[model samples]
Target: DLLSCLTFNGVRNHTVFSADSDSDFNRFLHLSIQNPLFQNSLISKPSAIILPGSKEELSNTIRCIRKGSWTIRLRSGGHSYEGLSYTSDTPFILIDLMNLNRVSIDLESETAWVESGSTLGELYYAITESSSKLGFTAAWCPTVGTGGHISGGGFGMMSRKYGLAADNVVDAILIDANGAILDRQAMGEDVFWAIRGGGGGVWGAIYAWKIKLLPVPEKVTVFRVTKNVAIDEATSLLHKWQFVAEELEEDFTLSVLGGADEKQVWLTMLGFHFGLKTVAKSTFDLLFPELGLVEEDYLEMSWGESFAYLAGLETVSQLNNRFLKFDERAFKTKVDLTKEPLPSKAFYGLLERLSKEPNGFIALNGFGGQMSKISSDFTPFPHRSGTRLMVEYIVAWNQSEQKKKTEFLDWLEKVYEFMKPFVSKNPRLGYVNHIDLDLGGIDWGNKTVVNNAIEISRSWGESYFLSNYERLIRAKTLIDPNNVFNHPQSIPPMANFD
Candidate 1:
């Protein structure tokens, strides 16, 4: 019966499915909704979900939707920060690609073709097993789905050297609204440009990506050191890191996590140097000896092992573990960019603000190196050049605190407002992967769900796209004029009058 509703006006195909009579469909939702991680979210519903076994099945599903003028939403990992993948106000069908987790690594070309449902952990394990020297620069969180992550502009540990994950995508395949499969060459440059960092599920369901892998040395070094602000010596080190975190060598990356710990605010510096431990310490000593990092604070590990170390994995052998063990505390995140270090007084003011909020913290990820070398127009991710660090503002608490959610939300907004004078101006860029709903643009005045592309493009489209959003819209309209394959934040077709 549910499938019948989806097939109204001939919207039926082999791969399409509904929950009305399907036992597995019931299991899918039960498992999805009952997952401990997604229990208390604002969005946790799916009218009907379709699982495609192959690209051909996907094409047939789209063909049926084209025949009926029905809209569809795309979902891969289901970890949508904003829950856009699962929540929809209007009646719609979900195209879940979780079954398409295939990864093929090419040792000769230093590239890999990965399906959308494949997790970052899977990709890392596959690459390390094939060759020691090959890997991709991607999110630190291993469980994140590759399909939506890169498409929405993911960045992490080695991003400073390789740029965002989207930057490494050499090619991709998508089944567009017209029921045609388009690859990198066939889709032309405009649509391809729009999909990479144009925001997830905006253009279409990205089936697979041909990613150019980055080089990794045989050995790399990692360090996690914390310096309490109670000591004047520690204060000096924090001040020095603020000045040179972005100016360090291209092979090195430094992340500073600051927050109120116990009675005082603590600053922890996490660094990864893609070289020997001795060399890493020597380099850091010359650049920043005030912190006095010793050999005991650093560890030498292989390229693959360092990925584990950076991500808090216990050992190299655990890299292939399919399930990621992360503390799933309730959390909210807002992204911001900085071109220069904040003045000492301003920095202190920020610390004081954090001191007042118990759960608030900032994770400052530095950039620049190969990232700056790439032009802004290379893709839709524009926070490349002139950026010192990308800041992740976060406030997390237990899921049971329904009352505290409002207070946490207010604090995050207040902090965002306070930092406005110091962050990037103009459109005020944000990381799409972080998924902040407050930014703007949501299909006229509607606030219950994500607006189609044209609406969201107004708020973030300009910040992410700059000048490219117009062409992206035009291309989407050309291919999907009926606006099938849409979600709250899906790109909209141009108006008929226009």
Candidate 2:
């Protein structure tokens, strides 16, 4: 009976595959579904799978999947995007930290400890293999997974000069739900400020992340300026790139990337200047000078070659490989966090629904310098200080293109319902690292978000912790109050606070 339930839960030495007579358990439960419509056959799979190679075999496989109540799914870099780290509609138990990928650089405490199955390109190629004047802020898709991108709060290109990746986490080590082993002083500081951004799989399994390193200046400057023009000049160059990308200057970082093919509407701003290239070409010719950035659109490199040239990679040792296994794609993303700035008549109707969407695309990063000097209640990632930009809206298909998957999800829900009247209204916010089950948080197949999960978790927890969702459900009712470590927009445990 599945090796007597993995030798009666002593964790039969880690790797235990079974979904009835393993044949490598259907190729290890289709190893991290890079979302082929959550890999067909009506989703719910995983009747057992574990790869735990230590941390006492991931604290005895999280005390043997919480004493066999199963439903544990936590694959490291499977790039979640709602495959919720390896699907689960129950009958679950996956713990694929893929042999617990490791990384430990100390570089005289510039810092590093990574292990939530390391990937942000193996912690940026192990911090440029331990220093080329170190670097790391977070996400530019170097195979995203610092335990769900530092608990869903990590933004990148050095987060406006160092801010998130859970603001350079100082320490971590969690495992609870009775498997014990906490850290960051025994998981106190309100469960380490709601597991960083207070979002990754309802906090209670992370097994490493200590980060706190940053320097990057060996020429680091990157720039791109593609344009297919005419949608009213890509709508006044993204309406002056939403106020010169959050009032520039914090070693600069401007971003944008809209797409379409049929005759015009392809924008691509992309800038990441921490240094050189004529000081980001004289600060974008003194503030977004209507996108005529001269000097053949810069490209300095070395801050890990401008993060392996925005992660399309070709070198920087292919980001120590954890993917690019023939470059997969089956995407879906939606996000927004604008404290203001979409009025170019709703940014020309979101570039006219990204030029009549086909395979979708649109990005817009740049939330003010030092992300508006932090403090949106310090953590639980409260779209910090009068936010600025974070609008993403992607769509990709093509694992034999699942019969036009509901026509690219109704053209990404008609450009996310035409940006709910220019973003950030009452609970109209997002970006819990672009996780949107139409922002109604978990209990899949949406049974009223799992029958009013603590009064329907403020419908997607105040759009990713805005007004800090009742101190992240009062730190999930003071640490997992029988809600064990849950999912479908996590943080539940409500024992009153009515």
The digit string of per-residue lDDT tens for model 1 on 1-498 reads 545544552433324334344566655543322123344424445556677777777776656544543456676666677666655665556677767788998888888999887878778888888888777888876767887898887788888788888999899997786668989888888788877887786677788988998888887888988877753443455557766677887788888888886547788888988788888888888888866799998888777787887777886666655455565566777888887676665566567678888788888877888888888778877777787777778888866775788898899888888888888888787767777777654542253333344654567666656666677687677656665555544556685322
lDDT of all predictions: 0.72, 0.78
Model 2 scores a TM of: 0.34
Model 2: CA > 4 A from native: 1-36, 39-44, 49-54, 59-74, 80-93, 96-108, 117-137, 140-143, 147-212, 216-255, 260-272, 275-281, 286-288, 292-359, 362-403, 406-498
What would you estimate as the lDDT of candidate 2? 0.78
Q: Among these predicted structures, which one has the highest lDDT?
A: 2
| Model 2 per-residue lDDT tens digits across residues 1-498 | 544655665655444444553467667667666666676666777766777776766776776666665777788877777888777667777787866778888899788898898888878888887788878888777777788889878888778888898978988998876778888898799888888898787767888988788888777888877877888888888888888888888888888888876636888788888888987888888887778888878888788878888876778888877756555667777877888777887878877777777578888886888878988878888887788888888888777877887888888888888888888888788877777777665563455555567677777777778678888887877767766667777767665322
Q: Which residue runs of candidate 1 sit more than 4 Å off their true CA positions?
A: 1-38, 41-44, 64-71, 231-238, 316-322, 444-456, 496-498
Residue 370 alpha-carbon offset, candidate 2, angstroms: 23
Query: What TM-score would every model get versus the actual structure?
Result: 0.88, 0.34
Candidate 1 yields a Cα-based lDDT of 0.72
